[PDB]
Write a protein that binds this ligand. Structure first.
Ligand SMILES: Cc1cc2nc3c(=O)[nH]c(=O)nc-3n(C[C@H](O)[C@H](O)[C@H](O)COP(=O)(O)OP(=O)(O)OC[C@H]3O[C@@H](n4cnc5c(N)ncnc54)[C@H](O)[C@@H]3O)c2cc1C
Ligand SMILES: O=C(O)[C@H]1CCCN1
Ligand SMILES: O=C(O)[C@H]1CCCN1
Length: 1216
């Protein structure tokens, strides 16, 4: 067998001193980056005065010489929404290729009546883009009902003339302004005018982010054909006077990433070389555009090989972008200048500020990394730019600097920095087509500054230009953007010519982080410290992780029955790597049923001593354990990789989740628990193999910090990481008597659950095992005669709905991740993709293409995307399903598996096309995506279909349309909703995780109601209240008063006020996301009363929390509820046969102890969901107004909305 981690992530090449200085700066603190940039960018007082004068002169020219859209809005008195709607209509009309056909539709159909009847795809799919054009503001989703009303209004008001003006306007903008031309030939024809004036061109073919091999091939042949046209047109003018091309490496390969570095060097590089050879033959420039920060250093390896490749010698046209908003920029320049010296190639270096800023902020926060790879104050980027220009200007003999900027202050600084000696070929400026020409017409030419400018010229169809136009608009359209500020009359020219170098120098703290951007560690402020991740694009990190992972694999991992009295003897067997059964990970000694029973008794004995540790100190143990897990993360990664079969990426996220659970439950403890919140007693924690550290730790930590001693029964498959979690918790101060580890199979779990002193059970696993546990617990009562609490999380049949407004590339990436990450072994994994019929074939084609780019194998290589499934039995169960579907004639797409997978248990990622959602009749816990199609008019029926399964865990929706968001999210019944992003990796305290129905009992893990289920008297969670009063509750209280039941009416009004139904919160989290948490009704609650007053109290509790009820007809209490108001009657039914009248969402039971036990067994016998049952005696109802706790009669819903999905972050446009 191959040695573990011997090939984890070797770099493309040994890292030179220059390359290592780049990596060293990746996330350097901002206060450390700025001082050397300030020094490098310093210029004399005389030069600064001259530069300020030149900048003022340029800005006065810019301001001395009204957009088309603004004139259109003015002429027709359009509101903003009308302007946006008009541009959307224009865009749609321009999708009609024949001019005479389009004009006939406008005259005969659009102008005179309903446009809706004439134009499967919303008119307003791209309204966020047109919103930026019309208003300058980015709104991430589209209010399509507002736009529809506006379009009707403006057409009914102004008719064909306004439609014609909109069409002509959109036609000009999309054919001449956002692009230089639709085709390279058209673009070239339109370039002669400014070339004759002294401009040059570099054509941007607008391709990026290939998703499939076919995409990458299409972008390749597009580049090749453009180079021929550009080279023919250049006609020997050379690389400075003549035109060139720009390419994006992400366009040329579907897996352009550090994780796939070997594929990039083997497959992407020869494609770039072939394009460069063609550029060399025509002697034109070929520029490599710069993209996301985690692609910078990878691109250097391609640049290095290309510049050293003798087949390309004699040609100085190779170019390369460096982004001055990046902390590595000067060190990258040092590397490039040296590469130019070694190779003798005069590398064309385009210095830009950078196009991906808000995405870099979000990504670093999501990944919990040490700092950002970009600056956070715009002025820091400006100083960086000028500092890097100084470095480039000192090396014009070996590189060709190209200063791409629309900022007249930046321009003037560099123009004077470069001095008096100039010749074409020394350096140039650059600008964007349709944006920079007003400024650079004051620069180019002997009558101006006599410096050349190359126009970066987009080329593409309407579809191509619209795909990432938002990101392009934000380059010059944010509050701190020069172009935005020059168009703001409230900004003086003096403000615009302010010298960023001197402003930064005089700051109290030079280089301070922006005050309004949280470091990833500080996302939650004073509440708790965010867990920290690891940057798998950082060579230093990969190198250190490689050694730590190797060392982890040499360790003799063990797991033992750890009782309160010490380790216990038992049957010992090895633990095998699921990706390679030859790889022995460790040894587990499993627990006898006798010792499991003994462990519960020991935990009961020790319960008072643990409950007496004050809550703040119990929370301090959790915080200490979180620190230990953070420090141990590399070793924990190795164990999770080898024992549980996970990728490094998923193992990092899992250790983060464990750390977050510990810190979250610690903080929630400090916010809530007091002397009156007594523990339940011994809690049995049964954890799954798919999150063998995170959910293991989460359940145990919550029970411990709530004051309960814990019996920890890890999954049979994954005992070693459990034993390590216990070692850490004990090292952090949890006493051995408070946390006992019982490895073994389900007999151990069953022995623990059945033990008389077990006071509560926390289970995450299959529905069938949860149901067996429920039946066990229904035999028992607490010493107080009350049901044993069960928290059971049990998976789902998770769907994602995609309509024709979603961006296919985004969908496919989110589907590939949601369905096949962790081999589909997440409970949150995407199981059914639902595609609107009109886009289903294109998305399916792209999805299948992306599927075949996945690398399946043993997960001790960074390049592996999908690892093994956990066991041979899991494998066999999944495969049986796939073959059953195949045998029914369903189309099945599968990746081929390499021969090396035979030593482990692997299922290839699979796509199965179904006719209807009901064709899927069992949860298939593997990498198996089912795809159905739906007509848009049947959307509401589809949501019914999703709900009808009875599950309700995770759910995804991809749409830009507010009406569709409102409709779907109001009708779906699931606990974790995700809008325009993947549906996996719920984040503790941000997406509290847990569902309803067949998916679980709740309360949500990583949410504020969790600890309260683990004590006998629940506290009031932080922020847990609602000002809204259920109106049916109010009608019931009035009915009670009319009947003379004045005590119960008062109790009803109190329940109405105490209810947190209607709670609606936004939780702190990363930028570019809105994370919402809301309390809803659970559904229909089964009421099993014994007395009239008990029934009234039960009804008050259920109604106050928004529920309907089914009242047990065998109570004989029908006469107690005569003449109900119709509003209340609508919510009330009587049930003789509880099994026929379900599913229920919870239950309230009244009776003595044996009545409660009998009803509990009867409820456990109901098919379907495990009900969260609350029981009370008649006397308890009389004595305790909280006898039925309202916490457990509401349903928690988490919704995470990717607000950056339109292409950028509106909120961050204000942050500079
Ligand atoms: C010819 C040309 C080629 C280009 N090629 C590329 C490319 O290959 N790769 C690429 O990434 N982009 C590219 N760009 C875009 C460029 O990087 C800028 O995003 C854009 O041109 C605006 O910058 P500026 O100097 O024109 O104007 P400015 O208004 O001076 O600068 C705006 C820039 O400031 C930065 N910024 C804004 N807010 C903050 C903040 N809070 N903290 C730190 N920095 C901030 C951003 O980078 C933003 O774009 C190119 C631009 C041009 C004109
Ligand atoms: O599992 C164990 O026994 C200890 C020793 C090796 C690493 N953890
Ligand atoms: O996979 C997820 O979404 C999170 C929630 C459950 C455990 N990890």
């Amino acid at each position: 067998a191959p040695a573990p981690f011997a090939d984890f992530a070797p770099p493309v090449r040994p890292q030179s001193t220059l390359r290592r200085a780049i990596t060293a700066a990746y996330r350097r603190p901002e206060t450390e980056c700025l001082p050397p940039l300030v020094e490098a960018a310093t210029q004399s007082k005389e030069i600064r005065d001259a530069a300020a004068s030149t900048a003022r002169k340029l800005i006065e020219a810019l301001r001395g010489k009204g957009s088309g859209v603004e004139g259109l809005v003015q002429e027709y008195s359009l509101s903003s929404q009308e302007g946006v709607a008009l541009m959307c209509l224009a865009e749609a009309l321009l999708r009609i290729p024949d001019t005479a056909t389009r004009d006939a539709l406008i005259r005969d159909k659009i102008a005179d009546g309903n446009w809706k009847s004439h134009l499967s795809r919303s008119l307003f799919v791209n309204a966020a883009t047109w919103g930026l054009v019309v208003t300058g503001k980015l709104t991430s989703t589209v209010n399509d009902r507002s736009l529809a009303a506006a379009l009707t209004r403006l057409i009914s008001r102004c008719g064909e003339p306004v439609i014609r003006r909109g069409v002509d306007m959109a036609m000009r903008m999309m054919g001449e302004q956002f692009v230089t031309g639709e085709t390279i030939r058209e673009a070239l024809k339109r370039s002669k005018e400014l070339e004759e004036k002294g401009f040059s061109y570099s054509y941007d073919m607008l391709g990026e982010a290939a998703t499939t091999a076919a995409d990458a091939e299409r972008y390749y042949r597009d580049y090749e054909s453009a180079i021929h046209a550009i080279g023919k047109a250049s006609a020997g003018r050379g690389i400075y006077e003549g035109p060139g091309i720009s390419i994006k490496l992400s366009a040329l390969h579907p897996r352009y990433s550090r994780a796939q570095a070997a594929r990039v060097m083997g497959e992407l590089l020869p494609r770039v070389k072939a394009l460069a050879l063609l550029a060399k033959n025509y002697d034109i420039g070929l520029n490599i555009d710069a993209e996301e920060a985690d692609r910078l250093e990878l691109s250097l390896d391609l640049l290095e090989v290309l510049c050293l490749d003798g087949d390309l010698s004699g040609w100085n046209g190779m170019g390369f972008v460096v982004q001055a908003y990046g902390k590595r920029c000067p060190f990258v320049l040092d590397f490039i200048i040296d590469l130019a010296r070694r190779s003798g190639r005069r590398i064309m270096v385009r210095l830009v500020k950078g196009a991906y800023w808000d995405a870099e902020i979000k990504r670093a926060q999501l990944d919990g990394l040490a700092d950002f790879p970009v600056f956070t104050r715009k002025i820091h980027t400006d100083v960086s730019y000028i500092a890097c220009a100084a470095k480039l200007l000192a090396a014009t003999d070996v590189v060709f600097p190209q200063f791409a900027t629309h900022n007249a202050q930046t321009l003037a600084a560099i123009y004077h920095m470069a001095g008096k000696d100039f010749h074409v070929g020394k350096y140039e400026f650059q600008c964007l087509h349709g944006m920079g020409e007003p400024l650079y017409e004051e620069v180019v030419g002997r009558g101006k500054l006599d410096r050349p400018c190359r126009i970066y010229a987009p080329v593409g169809t309407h579809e191509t230009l619209l795909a990432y136009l938002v990101r392009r608009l934000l380059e010059n359209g944010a509050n701190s953007s020069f172009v935005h500020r020059i168009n703001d009359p409230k900004v003086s020219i003096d403000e615009l010519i302010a010298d960023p170098v001197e402003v930064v120098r005089a700051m109290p703290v030079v280089g301070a982080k922006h005050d309004r951007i949280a470091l990833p560690a500080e996302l939650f402020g004073d509440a708790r410290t965010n867990s920290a991740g690891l940057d798998l694009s950082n060579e230093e990190t990969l190198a250190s992780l490689t050694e730590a992972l190797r060392e982890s694999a040499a360790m003799k991992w063990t797991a033992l029955p750890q009782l309160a009295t010490g380790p216990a003897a038992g049957e010992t067997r090895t633990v095998l790597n699921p990706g390679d059964h030859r790889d022995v990970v460790g040894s587990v000694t499993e627990t006898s049923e006798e010792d499991a029973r003994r462990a519960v008794r020991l935990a009961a004995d020790a319960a008072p001593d643990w409950a007496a540790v004050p809550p703040s100190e119990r929370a301090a143990c959790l915080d200490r354990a979180a620190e230990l897990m953070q420090a141990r993360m590399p070793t924990l990664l190795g164990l999770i990789i080898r024992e549980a079969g996970k990728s490094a990426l998923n193992a990092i996220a899992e250790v983060r989740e464990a750390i977050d659970f510990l810190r979250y439950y610690a903080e929630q403890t400090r916010r809530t628990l007091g002397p009156g919140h007594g523990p339940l007693g011994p809690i049995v924690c049964i954890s799954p193999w798919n999150f063998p550290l995170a959910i293991f730790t989460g359940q145990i930590a919550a029970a411990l910090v709530a004051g309960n001693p814990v019996l920890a029964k890890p999954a049979e498959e994954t005992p070693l990481i459990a034993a390590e979690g216990v070692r850490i918790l004990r090292e952090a101060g949890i006493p051995a008597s408070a946390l006992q580890l019982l490895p073994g199979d389900g007999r151990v779990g069953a022995a623990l659950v059945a033990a008389a002193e077990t006071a509560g059970v926390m289970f995450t696993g299959s529905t069938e095992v949860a149901r067996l546990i429920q039946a066990q617990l229904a035999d028992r009562l607490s010493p107080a005669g009350r049901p044993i609490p069960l928290i059971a999380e049990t998976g789902g049949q998770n769907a994602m709905i995609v309509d024709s407004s979603a961006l296919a590339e985004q969908v496919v990436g989110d589907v590939i991740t949601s369905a096949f990450d962790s081999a589909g072994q997440r409970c949150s994994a995407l199981r059914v993709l639902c595609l609107q019929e009109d886009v289903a074939d294109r998305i399916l084609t792209m999805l299948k293409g992306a599927l075949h780019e996945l690398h399946i194998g043993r997960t001790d290589r960074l390049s592996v995307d999908v690892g093994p499934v956990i066991t041979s039995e899991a494998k066999d169960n999944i495969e049986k399903h796939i073959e059953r579907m195949r045998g029914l004639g369903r189309k099945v797409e599968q990746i081929g598996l390499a021969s090396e997978t035979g030593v482990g248990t692997f299922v290839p990622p699979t796509i199965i096309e179904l006719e209807k959602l009901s064709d899927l009749q069992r949860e298939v816990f593997g990498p198996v995506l089912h795809v159905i199609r739906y007509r848009r008019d049947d959307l509401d029926r589809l949501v019914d279909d999703v709900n009808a399964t009875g599950y309700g865990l995770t759910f995804g929706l991809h749409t830009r349309l507010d009406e569709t968001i409102a409709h779907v999210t109001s009708r779906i019944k699931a606990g974790n909703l995700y809008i325009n992003r993947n549906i996996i990796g719920a984040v503790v305290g941000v997406q509290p995780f847990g569902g309803r129905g067949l998916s679980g009992t709740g309360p949500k893990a990583g949410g504020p109601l969790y600890l309260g289920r683990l004590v006998t008297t629940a506290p009031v969670p932080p922020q847990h209240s609602s000002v809204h009063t259920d109106p049916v509750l109010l009608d019931f209280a009035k009915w009670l008063d009319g009947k003379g039941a004045r005590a119960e009416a008062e109790a009803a009004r109190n329940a109405g006020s105490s209810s947190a139904l209607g709670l609606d919160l936004e939780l702190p989290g990363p930028v570019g996301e809105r994370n919402l948490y809301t309390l809803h009704a659970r559904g229909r609650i089964l009421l099993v009363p014994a007395t009239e007053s008990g029934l009234y109290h039960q009804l008050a509790a259920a109604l106050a929390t928004g529920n309907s009820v089914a009242i047990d007809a065998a109570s004989g209490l029908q006469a107690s509820l005569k003449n109900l108001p119709q509003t209340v009657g609508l919510r009330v039914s009587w049930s003789k046969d509880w099994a026929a009248d379900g599913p229920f969402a919870g239950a309230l039971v009244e009776g003595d102890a044996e009545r409660i036990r009998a009803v509990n067994k009867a409820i456990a016998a109901l098919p379907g969901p495990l009900l969260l049952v609350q029981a009370a005696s008649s006397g308890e109802i009389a004595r305790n107004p909280d006898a039925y706790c309202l916490n457990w009669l509401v349903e928690e819903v988490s919704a995470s909305i990717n607000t950056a999905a339109a292409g950028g972050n509106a909120s961050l446009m204000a942050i500079g």
